[PDB]
């Protein structure tokens, strides 16, 4: 009965994490979902899958493209650009 629910402001989510270096091959994999690049695998236990990319080398990502317009999966997949720094966090940090 009732099955009531409540949540914080829909526009919001917890803050982004700090910038971190990445390179490949690595025990980390990313995928495209809902016009965002998300962690597919690489969790120590669970607290990593479903996190979303927010910038790469300071280019705030246009969902799944760089600021320049490279698709993030191809951009990171290119081994000429394997060594990178990434900013990532909870999805829906803001609606835009």
Swiss-Prot record:
Gene Ontology biological process terms, A to Z: autophagy; COPII vesicle coating; dendrite development; endoplasmic reticulum to Golgi vesicle-mediated transport; vesicle coating; vesicle tethering
Keywords: Cell membrane, Endoplasmic reticulum, ER-Golgi transport, Golgi apparatus, Membrane, Postsynaptic cell membrane, Synapse, Transport
Compartment(s): Postsynaptic cell membrane; Golgi apparatus membrane; Endoplasmic reticulum; Vesicle
Associated disease: Neurodevelopmental disorder with epilepsy, spasticity, and brain atrophy: An autosomal recessive disorder characterized by severely impaired global development apparent soon after birth, early-onset seizures, lack of psychomotor development, spastic quadriparesis, progressive cortical and cerebellar atrophy, and dysmorphic features, including microcephaly. Death in childhood may occur.
Coverage span on the entire protein: 19 to 106 of 219
Keyword Endoplasmic reticulum: yes
Name of this chain's protein: Trafficking protein particle complex subunit 4
Gene Ontology CC annotation, any one: synapse
Function, as annotated: Core component of the TRAPP complexes which has a function of guanine nucleotide exchange factor activity for Rab1 GTPase. Plays a role in vesicular transport from endoplasmic reticulum to Golgi and autophagy. May play a role in dendrite postsynaptic membrane trafficking.
Coiled coil: none
